[PDB]
Nucleic acid binder design. Structure first.
Ligand code: ZN
Ligand code: ZN
Lengths: 360, 48, 116, 46, 372, 434
RNA sequence: AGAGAGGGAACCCACU
């Protein structure tokens, strides 16, 4: 079986390299200078280099001769190892989308109307424009009055509007964009985007108990953390061994009278001490105020940090009295009593009384 | 690099920790004077 | 031949049966260069839209499938040289698959992707 | 408000403006020389 | 420099050829205009004006192009780029002007010139010493394993390639060669682009001189002084195994900076090294085998004379052994590389614009920034 | 640099007449950096083809047509290092080549022939970079520089009899360093052509004048042979540092660090060589009535007592010019320099200095006194976040160099290479000797 | 009476 060899190519032009190599193979398949290679691979997501399938490196070198896009891999070739050849062809994989190209790249767009022609869909966007004022930008609301005032490419239909490169807006952009120009899988917007248009959090050092199983009511401190099945190693009371517990079995249990913080919800950012631990209602008093804050056991964490909660200046003067009489200078500094005069004649700045100075 | 930032005669250990720039210092030409004692230096006014 | 090779990068589509990658013009004018006799997408655009894919990953310029280990892993050794797709997203309707099976052609999926 | 510059090789004088390309009107010479100041100068003859 | 050497550089560059219908570009006749600034109209830029406005007192450089695609077309006075001019030259504005005219230009007659105006800054090219090229020298590396080492920093005049020093050394080991058989001292040569100590007799055989008698004729010009022949005897007796020109060239190709593949493509590499790398000043041609052999024999003979003391050793600080690179040679050495880079960029442009099937635009092919 | 060896730095014997023996930077670059002698001239080089044609014209046998038996009984002849052939009679060949060089028929004057006599070689060098110097030609212990040459040479600008005519007359010729190894050089004719207890009586060339072995800075030293050589070297270092009128058009030049003098004088004690460096037209220094006396004790250890009244009479009172250049940059609208008088209420980051010295365009009119940390160029660069309040473009101004003062000499306003406005301000400060 | 400074690196010539 032949082997795969890496050939460095021009970035972004790997598919065209394979097309050109196929055309070259077909154009010389009956001549006296045949391409003795077997196949050419240019993957979808591997950018920078392609692969040549051959029994020899010399075959690869004599086959890529005349191809300028591969000139940076012409002198030397590197073979893909035998065990890694299957990794070459291995492939892994009213809504919201995010635009791919343009100034609206990766911006949340509400899919308004799906056009059944499978070419484009109507998208609701927040304009990243300067209203034709700076260009001869963050997301802000579409101001139709400002774009009617500044003029330029603008057409008004009440709240409907066309502007600046056939951008369609209403009341909020409503413009068509291609399905292949958007990502229709894996956006998951947040609550702030809902206004515009389970979970596990275990931390090292926190205290947790066991709610079910044969190891119930064993409270231990958290050492490590993982994603879904954590296989935690808690340091229990009076046990030198490290046991194993997943996330569904544990719960953030805290003894009464300890440092507590709130991770998320309405009560986040506030600290304090808990008072009495019920089945799930855990009541606490804050470090700032003495108001009762009742929280879920999961919305608590163990953190030991403290809660946050003159006129003569620059005036050409003339010394009219004293040893320096008759000198013209410029006042650098001045006081109630004296003033420093930069003499025009000498390379020296000297201080004299204001009673000795006479302005020009 | 960091090793190049430390290893030199212009690095941190010689250049900045051993011999460093200091405030309250003056540098000007010396000219002779036989009318002052051996432990007296005549400094200018603009330096003083 | 050169008739199989696509002419440009725009509207490249991979076949659902043999993962043959061609432009929509070449599918409209030539059909499938391997198994059009079993599919008959020549002279019909809707047949092409039903029998070709708009989502593919990776291309292979299979030049000599008779002596290629890639053709052994992708099961395209008994075909003709051309541009093939590694991963193909899509599926034929049940009528076409049943008609192919009635002609002795079971439809093996070219979707060799590792879905999570 | 306009500043009078002496036009280098031309040795003539002309007005200038803010954000004005520096050109003479006689032959477009690029080098201008600013006129001597109007305020008084006094020199100790030492 | 600007009168002859620039034309020599332009003509000594090969006419670049591209293979599809082939086409080749050639530059034959150069033009050097007067310094001129500009956007703006062409006007004579006086050097004091270039000094005040932080300009560069540089004259534009044109050349004519001739391309054959064959379908030949010429292109007269194509702007290559601007090259600086030192003042009081023959191509400066104030050449031969009277002192009154200089005082009209705000330039003093007292100024000797000889400096460039680059961005308004006056630059002086300091003359750089170097060892005299194409001259055989015999030195003594008293710390190395060589008793007396000869060298010749060979550099052909009006050749874009730099110098390539060849060494003809004699292994010292005054007594035995750390062996039970190696009696005498063996002469060994360090060739360019060859990393091993090649014997002298190997090179002489590789030059098409198979007989020991002929090599000794080329080395020792008298056969009546047996002492020098006896001294050269061990070096002659090192390589009596290799007798053919083929085997000698194969041993030349062994252990090169670019090692050979097989017997094939290594004979050609050794031939290329012996043709274009060592001793370019005696000629680079097919018939220059015997002239190169004569000069190598002279080098070995001078080394033998140094080993005898019949001629004294050479001094590295004697100023008959040195050259002074002035603005001419320095700017020529710079212009060789920069003109070659301009040619390389033109070749890249042509390679880009022939593969589209179209015709290249030659004004866009020659970019003026790389040469100015 | 910084090599502990000495052989590349020492004053070799072949530095005679070609390079000054005294002038050198006496720092860590002793001997490495040198200064060329006065009459020394670097051969610009010519093509060797006419020489090869001339050699083939005469009975020179090429290497491709010789037997290897008649080589040792004849002289090997080189051109530019490459061995061109053999010749049987070295004499009457060197004589012929020299006879052609004393006439400039074929061989250029710069080209050099060297006949190695001990070992049978004759090498002709036509390289570009060799360093030679002109010498007289002594045919008989007689000089070829006759009285008629002096008569035709005194009356220049009338007979159009130049130095090149004397080179063409076969009287002087350029001898390089290789050829100096094979020449018998007379120092002066008044001593080395008269019969005595004879030294050699076989002179070939005569030195024109020994004072031409020195450089440009060692030529302004009066009686340099009476000094000690380190003193000559130190004076060669200092002489490129003396204040003086460095150029005649210094009022036009916007040079940085221009040191010029009020009343420069030519030296009362001068050399003949100062007439050719034009040191009497752009001098550097003043003739002073010095007294070498122990006194109150202020000329103790390399110091000098000066006369206050003489200094008040303009003695060594120099003037120091310093230029300041600044241009604005038209950029992608984020930062935009422009020359204007910055305002405290408008500009931000404005340093506390006098801004009323500036004119309406942000520049100083010539004839205005400025001192340390006085503004000379009012330039403001815009701030991209002026809208992203009420505080706008920041000050980017060039101050007068601190601990310096003086009057602004002249200001020039022009455009740069890029077409942007560009201003130079030359500030004048006289320097009374203290 | 509105109060601080920044560039940074590279390379040449000298100075004791
Ligand atoms: Zn198909
Ligand atoms: Zn004018």
């Amino acid at each position: 079986d032949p082997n795969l060899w890496t050939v460095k190519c021009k970035i972004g032009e790997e598919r065209a390299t394979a097309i050109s190599l196929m055309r070259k193979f077909i154009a010389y398949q009956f001549t006296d200078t045949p391409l003795q290679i077997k196949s050419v691979v240019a993957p979808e997501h591997v950018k920078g280099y392609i692969y040549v399938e051959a029994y020899k490196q010399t075959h690869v070198k004599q086959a890529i001769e005349g191809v300028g896009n591969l000139r940076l891999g012409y002198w030397n070739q590197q073979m893909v190892p035998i065990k890694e050849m299957t990794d070459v062809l291995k492939v892994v994989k009213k809504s919201w989308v995010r635009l791919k190209r343009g100034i609206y790249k990766d911006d949340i767009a509400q899919v308004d109307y799906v056009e059944p022609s499978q070419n484009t869909i109507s998208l609701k966007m927040i304009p990243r424009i300067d209203y034709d004022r700076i260009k001869a930008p963050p997301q802000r609301l579409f101001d139709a009055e400002k774009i009617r005032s500044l003029g330029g490419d603008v057409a008004s239909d009440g709240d409907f509007l066309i502007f600046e490169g056939n951008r369609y807006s209403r009341k909020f952009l409503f413009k068509s964009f291609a399905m292949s120009a958007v990502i229709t899988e894996g956006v998951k917007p947040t609550l702030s985007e809902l206004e515009k248009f389970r979970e596990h959090n275990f931390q090292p050092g926190d205290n947790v108990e066991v709610c079910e199983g044969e190891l119930i009511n064993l409270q231990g401190k958290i050492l490590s953390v993982d994603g879904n099945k954590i296989t935690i190693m808690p340091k229990h009371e009076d046990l030198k061994d490290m046991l194993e517990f997943p996330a569904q079995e544990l719960r953030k249990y805290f003894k009464m009278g300890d440092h507590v913080k709130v991770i998320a919800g309405r009560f986040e950012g506030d600290t304090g001490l808990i008072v009495r631990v019920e089945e799930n209602f855990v009541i606490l008093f804050s470090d700032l105020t003495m108001h009762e804050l009742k929280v879920l056991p999961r919305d608590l964490q163990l953190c030991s940090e403290t809660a946050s909660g003159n006129e003569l200046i620059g005036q050409t003067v003339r010394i009219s009295q004293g040893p320096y009489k008759g000198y013209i200078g410029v006042v650098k500094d001045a006081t109630e009593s004296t003033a420093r005069v930069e003499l025009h004649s000498t390379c020296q700045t000297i201080s004299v009384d204001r009673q000795r100075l006479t302005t020009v | 690099s960091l090793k190049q930032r430390l290893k030199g005669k212009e690095g941190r250990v010689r250049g900045n920790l051993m011999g460093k720039r200091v405030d309250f210092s003056a540098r000007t030409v010396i000219t002779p004077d036989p009318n002052l004692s051996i432990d007296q230096v005549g400094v200018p006014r603009s330096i003083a | 031949a050169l008739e199989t090779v696509p002419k440009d990068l725009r509207h490249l589509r991979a076949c659902l049966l043999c993962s043959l990658v061609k432009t929509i013009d070449q599918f409209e004018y030539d059909g499938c260069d391997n198994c059009d006799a079993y599919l008959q997408m020549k002279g019909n655009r809707e047949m092409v839209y039903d029998c070709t894919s708009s989502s593919f990953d990776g291309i292979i310029a299979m030049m000599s499938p008779e002596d290629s280990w890639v053709s052994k892993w992708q099961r395209v050794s008994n075909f003709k040289p051309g541009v093939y797709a590694v991963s193909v997203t899509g599926r034929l309707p049940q009528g076409i698959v049943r008609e192919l099976k009635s002609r002795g052609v079971a439809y093996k999926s070219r979707d060799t992707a590792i879905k999570t | 408000q306009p500043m009078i510059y002496i036009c280098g090789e031309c040795h003539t004088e002309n007005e200038i403006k803010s954000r004005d390309p520096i050109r003479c009107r006689e032959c477009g010479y690029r080098i201008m020389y600013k006129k001597r100041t109007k305020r008084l100068v006094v020199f100790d003859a030492r | 420099f600007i009168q002859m050497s620039v034309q020599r550089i332009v003509e000594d560059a090969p006419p670049i050829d591209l293979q599809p219908p082939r086409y080749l570009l050639k530059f034959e006749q150069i033009y050097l205009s007067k310094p001129t600034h500009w956007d703006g109209a062409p006007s004579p830029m006086m050097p004091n004006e270039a000094r005040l406005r932080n300009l560069t007192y540089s004259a534009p450089l044109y050349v004519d192009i001739t391309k054959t695609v064959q379908l030949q077309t010429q292109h007269q006075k194509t702007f290559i780029g601007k090259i600086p001019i030192m003042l009081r030259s023959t191509y400066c504005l104030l050449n031969g002007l009277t002192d009154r005219d200089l005082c009209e230009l705000n330039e003093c007659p007292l100024d000797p010139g000889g400096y460039f105006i680059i961005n308004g800054s006056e630059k002086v090219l300091i003359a750089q010493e170097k060892m005299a090229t194409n001259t055989v020298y015999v030195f003594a590396k008293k710390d190395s394993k060589y008793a007396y080492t000869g060298e010749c920093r060979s550099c052909l005049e009006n050749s874009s390639r730099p110098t390539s020093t060849i060494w003809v050394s004699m292994l010292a080991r005054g007594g035995q060669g750390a062996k039970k058989s190696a009696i005498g001292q063996r002469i060994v040569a360090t060739l360019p682009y060859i990393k091993q100590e090649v014997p002298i007799i190997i090179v002489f055989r590789a030059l098409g001189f198979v007989s020991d008698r002929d090599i000794l004729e080329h080395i020792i010009y008298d056969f009546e002084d047996p002492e020098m022949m006896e001294m050269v005897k061990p070096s002659l007796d090192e390589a009596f195994v290799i007798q053919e020109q083929n085997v000698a060239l194969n041993f030349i190709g062994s252990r090169g900076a670019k090692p050979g593949v097989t017997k094939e493509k290594r004979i050609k590499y050794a031939k290329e090294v012996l043709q274009k790398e060592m001793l370019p000043h005696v000629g680079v041609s097919d018939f220059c085998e015997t002239k190169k052999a004569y000069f190598l024999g002279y080098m070995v003979h001078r080394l033998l004379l140094a080993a005898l003391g019949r001629r004294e050793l050479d001094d590295r600080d004697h100023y008959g052994n040195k050259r002074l690179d002035l603005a001419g040679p320095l700017l020529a050495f710079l212009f060789r590389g920069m003109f070659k880079n301009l040619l390389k960029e033109v070749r890249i442009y042509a390679q880009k614009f022939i593969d589209r099937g179209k015709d290249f635009n030659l004004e866009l092919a020659i970019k003026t920034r790389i040469i100015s | 640099r910084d090599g502990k060896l000495a052989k590349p730095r020492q004053l070799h014997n072949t530095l005679w007449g070609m390079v000054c023996p005294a002038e050198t930077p006496e720092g860590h670059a002793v001997g490495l950096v040198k200064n060329l002698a006065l009459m020394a001239y670097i051969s610009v080089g010519s093509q060797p083809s006419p020489i090869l044609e001339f050699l083939e014209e005469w009975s020179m046998e090429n290497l491709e047509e010789i037997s290897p038996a008649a080589i040792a009984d004849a002289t090997k002849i080189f051109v530019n290092g490459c061995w061109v052939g053999i010749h049987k009679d070295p004499e009457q060949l060197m004589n012929t080549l020299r006879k052609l060089r004393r006439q400039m028929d074929i061989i250029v004057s710069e080209v050099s022939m060297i006949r190695d006599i001990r070992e049978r070689e004759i090498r002709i060098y036509t390289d570009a970079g060799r360093i030679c110097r002109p010498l007289l030609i002594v045919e008989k212990q007689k000089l070829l520089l006759k009285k008629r040459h002096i008569d035709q040479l005194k009356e220049r600008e009338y007979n159009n009899y130049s130095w090149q005519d004397l080179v063409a007359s076969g009287v002087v010729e350029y001898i390089d360093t290789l050829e100096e190894e094979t020449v018998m050089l007379a120092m002066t004719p008044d001593d080395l052509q008269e019969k005595e207890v004879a030294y050699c009586s076989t002179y070939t060339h005569c030195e024109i004048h020994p004072s031409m072995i020195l450089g440009v800075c060692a030529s302004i030293i009066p009686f340099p042979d009476h000094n000690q050589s380190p003193r000559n070297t130190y004076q060669s270092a200092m002489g490129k540092q003396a204040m003086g009128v460095y150029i005649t058009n210094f009022h036009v030049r916007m040079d940085t660090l221009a040191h010029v003098l009020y009343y420069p004088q030519k030296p009362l004690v001068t050399t003949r060589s100062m007439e050719y460096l034009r040191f009497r037209e752009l001098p550097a220094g003043i003739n002073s009535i010095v007294a070498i006396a122990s006194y109150t004790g202020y000329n103790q250890e390399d110091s000098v007592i000066m006369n206050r009244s003489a200094v008040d009479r303009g003695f060594f009172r120099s003037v120091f010019y310093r230029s300041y250049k600044e241009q604005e940059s038209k950029k992608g609208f984020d930062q935009e320099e422009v020359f204007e008088k910055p305002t405290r209420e408008t500009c931000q980051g404005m340093r506390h200095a006098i801004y009323d010295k500036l004119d309406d365009d942000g520049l100083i009119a010539p004839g205005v006194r400025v001192s340390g940390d006085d503004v000379i160029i009012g330039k403001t660069v815009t701030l991209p976040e002026n809208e992203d309040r009420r505080y706008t473009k920041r000050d980017c101004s060039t101050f007068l160099r601190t601990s310096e003062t003086g009057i602004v000499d002249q200001v020039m306003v022009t455009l740069n290479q890029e077409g942007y406005k560009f201003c130079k301000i030359r500030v004048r400060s006289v320097r009374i000797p203290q």
